[PDB]
Amino acid sequence: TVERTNIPRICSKGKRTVDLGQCGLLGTITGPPQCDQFLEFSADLIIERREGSDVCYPGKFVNEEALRQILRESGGIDKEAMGFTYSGIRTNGATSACRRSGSSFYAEMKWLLSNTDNAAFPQMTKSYKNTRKSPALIVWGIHHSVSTAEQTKLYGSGNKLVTVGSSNYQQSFVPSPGARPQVNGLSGRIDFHWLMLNPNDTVTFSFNGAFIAPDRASFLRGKSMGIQSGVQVDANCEGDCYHSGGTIISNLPFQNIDSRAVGKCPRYV
Amino acid sequence: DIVMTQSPSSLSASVGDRVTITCRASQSFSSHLNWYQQKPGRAPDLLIYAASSLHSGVPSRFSGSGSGTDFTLTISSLQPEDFAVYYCQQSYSVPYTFGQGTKLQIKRTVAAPSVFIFPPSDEQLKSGTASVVCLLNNFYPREAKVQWKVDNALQSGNSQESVTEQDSKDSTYSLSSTLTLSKADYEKHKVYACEVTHQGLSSPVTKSFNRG
Amino acid sequence: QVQLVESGPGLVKPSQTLSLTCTVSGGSINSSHSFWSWIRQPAGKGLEWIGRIYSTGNSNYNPSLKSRVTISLDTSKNQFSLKLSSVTAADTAVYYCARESLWNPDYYYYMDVWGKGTLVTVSSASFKGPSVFPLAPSGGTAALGCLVKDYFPEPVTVSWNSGALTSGVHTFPAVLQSSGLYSLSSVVTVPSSSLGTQTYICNVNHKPSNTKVDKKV
Ligand SMILES: *[C@@H]1O[C@H](CO)[C@@H](O)[C@H](O)[C@H]1NC(C)=O
Numbered sequence: 300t301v302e303r304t305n306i307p308r309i310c311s312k313g314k315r316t317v318d319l320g321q322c323g324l325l326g327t328i329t330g331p332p333q334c335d336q337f338l339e340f341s342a343d344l345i346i347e348r349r350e351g352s353d354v355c356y357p358g359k360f361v362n363e364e365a366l367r368q369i370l371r372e373s374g375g376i377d378k379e380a381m382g383f384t385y386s387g388i389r390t391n392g393a394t395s396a397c398r399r400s401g402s403s404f405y406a407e408m409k410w411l412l413s414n415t416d417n418a419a420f421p422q423m424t425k426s427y428k429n430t431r432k433s434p435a436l437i438v439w440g441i442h443h444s445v446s447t448a449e450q451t452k453l454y455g456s457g458n459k460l461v462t463v464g465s466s467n468y469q470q471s472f473v474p475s476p477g478a479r480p481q482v483n484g485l486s487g488r489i490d491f492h493w494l495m496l497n498p499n500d501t502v503t504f505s506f507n508g509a510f511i512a513p514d515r516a517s518f519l520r521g522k523s524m525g526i527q528s529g530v531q532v533d534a535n536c537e538g539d540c541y542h543s544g545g546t547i548i549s550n551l552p553f554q555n556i557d558s559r560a561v562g563k564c565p566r567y568v
Numbered sequence: 569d570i571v572m573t574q575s576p577s578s579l580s581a582s583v584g585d586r587v588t589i590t591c592r593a594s595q596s597f598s599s600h601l602n603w604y605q606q607k608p609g610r611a612p613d614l615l616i617y618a619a620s621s622l623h624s625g626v627p628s629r630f631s632g633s634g635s636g637t638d639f640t641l642t643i644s645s646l647q648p649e650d651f652a653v654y655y656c657q658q659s660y661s662v663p664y665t666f667g668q669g670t671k672l673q674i675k676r677t678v679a680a681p682s683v684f685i686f687p688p689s690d691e692q693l694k695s696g697t698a699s700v701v702c703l704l705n706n707f708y709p710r711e712a713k714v715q716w717k718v719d720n721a722l723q724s725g726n727s728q729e730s731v732t733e734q735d736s737k738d739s740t741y742s743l744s745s746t747l748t749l750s751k752a753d754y755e756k757h758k759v760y761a762c763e764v765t766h767q768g769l770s771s772p773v774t775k776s777f778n779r780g
Numbered sequence: 781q782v783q784l785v786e787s788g789p790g791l792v793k794p795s796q797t798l799s800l801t802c803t804v805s806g807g808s809i810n811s812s813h814s815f816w817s818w819i820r821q822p823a824g825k826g827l828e829w830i831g832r833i834y835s836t837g838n839s840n841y842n843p844s845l846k847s848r849v850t851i852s853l854d855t856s857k858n859q860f861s862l863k864l865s866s867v868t869a870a871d872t873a874v875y876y877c878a879r880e881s882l883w884n885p886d887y888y889y890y891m892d893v894w895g896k897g898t899l900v901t902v903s904s905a906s907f908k909g910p911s912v913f914p915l916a917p918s919g920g921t922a923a924l925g926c927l928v929k930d931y932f933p934e935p936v937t938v939s940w941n942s943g944a945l946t947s948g949v950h951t952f953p954a955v956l957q958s959s960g961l962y963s964l965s966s967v968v969t970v971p972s973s974s975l976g977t978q979t980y981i982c983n984v985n986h987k988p989s990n991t992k993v994d995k996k997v
Contacts, residue, residue: 623892
């Protein structure tokens with residue numbers, strides 16, 4: 300009445316299955332060098348890996364576990380340029396951690412600096428209206444310098460403030476400079492925030508520094524399934540429930556092999 | 569705007585009880601919720617930020633659980649000084665919004681009031697009005713009846729009462745019935761009595777004084 | 781130790797601009813992690829976030845009040861102000877300073893410093909200081925006090941022996957009379973033996989009138 304034997308492989312017959320490999324699922328939105336194959340993908344079954352990382356320049360995703368659940372059942376992501384134009388900033392930051400052929404940065408973000416070292420960063424305002432019929436995933440970043448002088452050298456002296464405004468959201472953010480444990484040879488940090496922009500709605504970024512502006516916006520293609528595993532993928536076997544151990548193949552109404560398996564599955568016992 | 573519906577508008581709990589106050593959101597904002605304790609006459613003090621993390625300085629008996637849209641403030645072992653009004657705050661997006669508030673009242677054993685009567689001052693009579701004040705001190709519960717007698721004549725619409733916020737130490741109320749007359753009327757009668765009937769008294773108490 | 785103090789007129793006339801001011805002690809107003817905010821509370825009602833300001837000068841106003849609200853800061857004086865235009869009878873409330881701490885690394889903000897609060901009634905009637913008469917005590921414990929009468933507007937704040945007597949003091953809520961003036965009594969129970977020895981002066985402070993009466997009982 301309850302299946303106890305599973306398949307030690309991920310049965311990908313009949314469904315579009317993408318093994319993200321060395322890239323974490325959230326990396327597809329920002330675009331580190333390891334998500335260049337999956338900046339725009341479509342899939343029915345997304346498979347994360349333990350080695351995959353959402354990040355190249357050390358940092359974190361704010362509200363990441365909620366966003367990962369959104370991305371796991373997205374059917375993929377489509378991109379579109381938000382058409383931002385700048386005058387009076389460097390607009391081409393780079394870091395040794397995000398390396399393609401030398402120093403680079405996130406493929407979908409743009410690190411904004413002052414023109415020269417310790418020069419001023421002018422107050423700017425950029426807007427983007429979601430023209431499509433689907434909600435637009437929109438991601439921005441806040442760079443925490445390692446010292447007060449680094450933030451002064453990069454974006455100029457004075458207090459920095461980033462404010463994000465939509466029809467259903469409005470909050471301001473501030474960088475906190477300080478020396479943090481060395482991750483990838485760096486103590487600075489870049490934190491990524493996100494929000495959903497409705498159709499015919501306009502996001503608005505007002506800032507004067509320490510702002511990792513987005514270049515493109517993401518859109519969800521459809522529906523999919525998202526698991527993390529270390530098992531191999533099987534193309535000839537067909538399954539409807541999956542977990543970290545593999546594939547659950549059963550007609551019994553119950554099972555007692557995993558408690559959080561996704562997909563059409565028997566109830567946990 | 570994010571509506572904040574906060575349940576238990578008012579409640580009564582005994583010292584040592586485990587009180588729970590709930591707050592529910594119109595959105596789901598990943599636990600951007602703060603709790604404030606506002607005692608009478610004071611500004612709200614921050615108890616809990618980010619739903620579950622205690623603010624430095626508040627006692628350990630304040631807890632905060634909640635996920636998504638439903639959050640609960642919990643006071644394990646309620647103490648008499650916890651009498652206040654508690655508010656939940658949404659810290660997700662401005663304009664910031666608060667709950668309607670929860671007045672937490674303390675339940676104690678019934679206590680009888682000490683009754684005092686105060687004649688009007690000779691200085692006030694020069695103004696032409698007379699204020700006779702009757703005091704009920706440190707009683708529980710809140711309900712109490714005060715009757716004014718002037719020469720054994722019942723008084724109607726010249727009284728005005730007001731009770732204090734229940735005490736932060738013994739959780740007792742105190743009220744003041746102040747009878748207002750005119751000087752001409754005050755000098756016409758001699759015996760002024762304040763009669764108090766309270767549930768912890770058995771027999772009604774009357775405190776009187778003579779004018780002359 | 782950051783501390784905030786409200787300073788402003790206690791009453792304003794209808795259809796005028798209400799102006800308050802916050803003096804911030806124990807810290808610079810150019811702190812990189814502080815949104816200086818204003819929150820008001822109608823007496824007996826809930827809290828209403830008015831608006832906040834950053835050291836850079838950027839502000840966010842409540843959309844209901846955005847038409848009539850202006851917030852500014854004075855970096856030289858270590859102060860920030862709030863000006864509510866076209867005041868109506870509904871704007872009668874207690875107005876609080878507040879500092880929103882942005883120090884949290886997980887981006888969870890909170891008001892951790894509040895001012896004492898300043899009541900602002902709005903009315904056409906001019907203010908009037910209070911008259912204070914004794915409540916003579918007339919063993920066990922005796923009760924004495926002093927009756928504060930005929931003042932406007934709120935609030936009045938009573939002390940006993942310049943704050944050195946707090947145990948056993950009850951100051952009652954204000955009651956509005958037919959005249960449109962307020963009255964309240966402040967009582968204190970003391971040892972009946974202490975009547976002849978110790979003196980009891982009650983300190984009635986009425987900031988709307990700049991008056992402060994001291995009545996010995
Ligand atoms: C979005 O706005 C455009 C321009 O007003 C309009 O043509 C379109 O129908 C709108 N779509 C939706 C879904 O509101």
